[PDB]
Amino acid sequence: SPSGSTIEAGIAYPISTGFDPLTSSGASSMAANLHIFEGLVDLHPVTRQPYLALAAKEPEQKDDLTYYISLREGAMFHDGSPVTTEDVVYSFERVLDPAKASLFAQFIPFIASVTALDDNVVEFKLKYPFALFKERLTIIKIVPKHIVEAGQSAFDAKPIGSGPYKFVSATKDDRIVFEANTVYNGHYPAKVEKMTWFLLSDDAARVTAQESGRVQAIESVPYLDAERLKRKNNVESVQSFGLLFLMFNCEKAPFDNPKVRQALHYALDKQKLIDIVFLGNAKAATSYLQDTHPDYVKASSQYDYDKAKAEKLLAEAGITNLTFQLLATDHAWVKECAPLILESWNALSVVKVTLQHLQSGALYSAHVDKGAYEVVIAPGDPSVFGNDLDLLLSWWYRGDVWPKRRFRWANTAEYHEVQKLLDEAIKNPAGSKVAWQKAINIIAEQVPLYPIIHRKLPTAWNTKKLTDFQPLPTTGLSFLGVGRT
Ligand SMILES: CC(=O)N[C@H]1[C@H]([C@H](O)[C@H](O)CO)O[C@](O)(C(=O)O)C[C@@H]1O
Numbered sequence: 001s002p003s004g005s006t007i008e009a010g011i012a013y014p015i016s017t018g019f020d021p022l023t024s025s026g027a028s029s030m031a032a033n034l035h036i037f038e039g040l041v042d043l044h045p046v047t048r049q050p051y052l053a054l055a056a057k058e059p060e061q062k063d064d065l066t067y068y069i070s071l072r073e074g075a076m077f078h079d080g081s082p083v084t085t086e087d088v089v090y091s092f093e094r095v096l097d098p099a100k101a102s103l104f105a106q107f108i109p110f111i112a113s114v115t116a117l118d119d120n121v122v123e124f125k126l127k128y129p130f131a132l133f134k135e136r137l138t139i140i141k142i143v144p145k146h147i148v149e150a151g152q153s154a155f156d157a158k159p160i161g162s163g164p165y166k167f168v169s170a171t172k173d174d175r176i177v178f179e180a181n182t183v184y185n186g187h188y189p190a191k192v193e194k195m196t197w198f199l200l201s202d203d204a205a206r207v208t209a210q211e212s213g214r215v216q217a218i219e220s221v222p223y224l225d226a227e228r229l230k231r232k233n234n235v236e237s238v239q240s241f242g243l244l245f246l247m248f249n250c251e252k253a254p255f256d257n258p259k260v261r262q263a264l265h266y267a268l269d270k271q272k273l274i275d276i277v278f279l280g281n282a283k284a285a286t287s288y289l290q291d292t293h294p295d296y297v298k299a300s301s302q303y304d305y306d307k308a309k310a311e312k313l314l315a316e317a318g319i320t321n322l323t324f325q326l327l328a329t330d331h332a333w334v335k336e337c338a339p340l341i342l343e344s345w346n347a348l349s350v351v352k353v354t355l356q357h358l359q360s361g362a363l364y365s366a367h368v369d370k371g372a373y374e375v376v377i378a379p380g381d382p383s384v385f386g387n388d389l390d391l392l393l394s395w396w397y398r399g400d401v402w403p404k405r406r407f408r409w410a411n412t413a414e415y416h417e418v419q420k421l422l423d424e425a426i427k428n429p430a431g432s433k434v435a436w437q438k439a440i441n442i443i444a445e446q447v448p449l450y451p452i453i454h455r456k457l458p459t460a461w462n463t464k465k466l467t468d469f470q471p472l473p474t475t476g477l478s479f480l481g482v483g484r485t
Contacts, residue, residue: 002180002182002189002190002191002192002193003193004193005191005192005193005483005484006192006193006194006195006196006484007192007194007195007196007216007466007479007482007484008195008196008197008198008214008215008216009195009196009197009198009215009216009217009218009219009477009479010197010198010200010206010209010210010214010215010217010218010219011028011031011176011197011198011199011200011219011476011477012027012028012200012201012206012218012219012220012331013026013027013028013031013199013201013219013220013331013360013475014028014172014173014199014201014330014359014360014361015028015029015170015172015176015199015361016028016029016359016360016361016364017029017361018156018157018159019032019033019036019155019156019157019158019159019167019170020143020148020152020155020156020159021033021037021091021104021140021141021143021159022094022095022100022102022103022104022143022152023101023102023103023104023156024156025103025104026360026361027381027384027475027476028176028197028199028476030384030475030476031197031384031475031476031477031478032159032167032170032176032178032197033141033159033161033163034163034476034478034480035163035164035165035178035195035478035479035480036078036159036161036163036165036166036167036178037141037142037143037159037161037162037163038053038054038141038142038161038162038163038186039053039054039137039138039139039140039141039142040053040054040055040059040069040088040122040137040140040142041053041055041059041134041135041137041138042137042138043135043138043386044480045472045474045476045478045480046470046471046472046473046478048386048387048473050134050135050138051187052072052186052187053072053138053186053187054071054072054075054083054088054142054162054186055069055070055071055072055137056070056071056072056073056120057070059124059133059134064126064129065112065125065126065127065128065129066123066124066125066126067123067124067126067133068117068121068122068123068124069088069121069122069124070120070121070122071083071084071085071088071120071121071122072185072186073185074183074185075162075185075186076162076183077144077147077160077161077162078160078161078162078166078167078181079144079147079160080183081144081146083142083144083162084116084119084145085116085117085118085119085120085121085122086116086145087142087143087144087145088114088116088122088142089114089115089116089122090143090145090148091140091141091142091143091145092108092111092114092140093114094143094148095108095140096108096111096114103401104139104140104385105399105401106394106395106398106399106401107136107139107385107391107394107395108136108139108140109127109394109398109399109423109426110126110127110128110130110133110426111124111125111126111127112125112126112127113125128426128427129429130426131429132386132388132390132391135386135388136386136391138385138386139385139386141161142161142162143155143160143161144160144161147160157170162181162184163181163184163186164180164181164184164186164188164189164190164480165178165179165180165181165190165195165479166178166179166180166181168194172199173199173201174198174199175196175197175198175199176196176197176199177194177195177196177197178194178195178196178197179193179194179195180192180193180194188480188481191467191479191481191482191483191484192479192483192484195479197477198214198215200218201330201331201332202332203222203225203332203333204222206218206219206220206222207221207222207225207229210229210233210460210462211228211229211232213462216461216462216465216466216469216484217459217460217461217462217466217469217477218459218460218461219459219475219476219477220457220458220459220475221235221237221458221459221460222332222333223277223278223279223281223458224279226458226460229460232462233460233461233462233463234460234461234462234463235458235459235460236458236459236460236471237281237456237457237458238456238457238458238459238471238472238473239290239292239456239457239473240290240381240383240454240455240456240457240473240474241289241290241293241381241382241383241387241392241454241473241474242379242380242381242383242454242455242457242474242475243285243290243379243380243381243451243452243453243454243455244334244337244377244378244379244451244452244453244455245377245378245379245380245449245450245451245452246264246265246375246376246377246447246449246450246451246452247368247375247376247377247378247406247407247448247449248261248374248375248376248407248447248448248449249371249373249374249375249407249408250407250408250409250412250448251371251408251409251411252371252374252408254317254319254322255324255374255375257317258445258446258447259313259314259316259317260313260314260317260319260322261446261447261448262301262303262313262445262447263309263310263311263313263314263317263319263348264310264345264351264375265303265447265450265452266303266304266305266306266307266309266310266313267305267307267310267344267345267347267348267351268303268305268341268344268345268452269305269340269344270284270303270304270305270452270453271284271305272340273337273340273341273452273453274453276336276340277333277336277337277340278333278453278455281455281456281458282453282454282455282456283453283454284303284304284452284453285303285450285451285452285453285454286298286299286302287299287440287444288392288393288440288443288444288450288451289389289392289454290454293387295389295433295436297433297437297440299440299441299444300441300444300445301441301444301445301447303447307344307347307348310348311348311349311350314348314350314351315350319350319351320350321350322350322351322352323351323352323353323354324351324353324354324374324375325353325354325355325356325373325374325375326338326341326342326345326353326354326355326356326374326375326376326377327356327357327358327363327367327368327373327374327375327376327377328355328356328357328358328376328377328378329357329358329359329360329363329377329378329379330357330358330359330360331360331379334377334378334379335357337377337452338355338357338377339355341377342354342355360378363376363378364406368406369405369406371408377452380395380396381474381475382395382396383473383474384474384475384476389425389432389436390422390425390426390432390436393422393436393439393440394422396449397418397422397439397443398419398422399419402449403415403448406449407448407449409446409448412446414442414446417439417442418439418442418443421435421436421438421439421442422435422439425439457471457472457473457474457475458471459471459472459477464485465484465485466482466483466484466485467482467483467484467485468481468482468483469482
């Protein structure tokens, strides 16, 4: 009975993108969209298991290339309109259309066409068989065509979906407000009438909110505060793909030289970062994946701290007096890693580095997407979309979204080989493990964008106030199925 009760939560990530699922890659926007939008099939935020959302029943697989999905009876958008098969077609076609510049088409490269057969059934035709078809549907949220066509920017700021919570408002550095969608008839109806996410990127403010009872759960517990929070709260730390990456503009001298990119990895003392910033709750990367991922295989290139090796590579690359600027995001823990990275690099005999911090939204729109940068450290976690290896590789390495328009490595022979390998692993599934490891090993040698560390992710919540809350293995918070005591 969502009347008389509310949920308040502390979210760690500022709003850095809008909410249009065409482009909403910001951590806090994606988390909101788990509640505002539905796919045809969604993955549970905690268990990652698929469940029927806008699909009325299990997708009917006619053959390896053909699936039919029927819409849940009575499904409605938050404006009171029915969800239609045209809305489904529109949602997939806009992601697939290169002109629309989605951030996510590289997660559905196997879809050939989406067609409305009648007012209930949609036909999906695939380019080749893809066993994870249903699992990927969670990425393509179903949007109301009549709203989006009336103004994409307005929809991006005020999203309308079919999920159990309706968007009320979002105010930067303040809060996102949701309300129960009382016409939702899926599996996870809103258990409270109103939910407020306070945007508390400041570590201390976020912890204080939990301690004071201003919120019932907080994302991304600062490691230093975990012990004191345990007195009155549950604190649980979950193994995660979530990582800190080092990203180079590979078309700007001298970071177009792989030896320079390698050198800067070798120059970093990861154990010091882990001790000082993460309190042991992270591991230096030894592959693309974290070592607890089921598909982890250790990469053939390792970057254990070795200053002499860094110096040797720089001398081979002809570096005698390199001065560059590192851009970093503003996440409190990224701000803590940055000076330590700078100290390690400034200790090199031929490198001097300065630092600039920026909010993530401006970092991408004003610098990265234009190529107006040299080197970035930033956090990333595409495991929000799913946990399969093609997906995690594709986010950063399939197509153009990052390799062409962000880290600018798409003109290399190595990039083209990686594309062939990523395609082979999904078009020839019997060869996938071999093909993925070849791609990962090229990526790990070339280090265009590569993890420095993967981290354990702690969440805190009050079990006396919330029912059925569980922490995620990804960024965000989930209140699907969660109520108040
Ligand atoms: C799926 C994913 O990894 N999203 C990440 C995004 C994107 O890197 C950014 O929006 C550019 O697309 O940035 C963050 O929101 C951020 O830096 O605050 C972290 C988040 O984990």
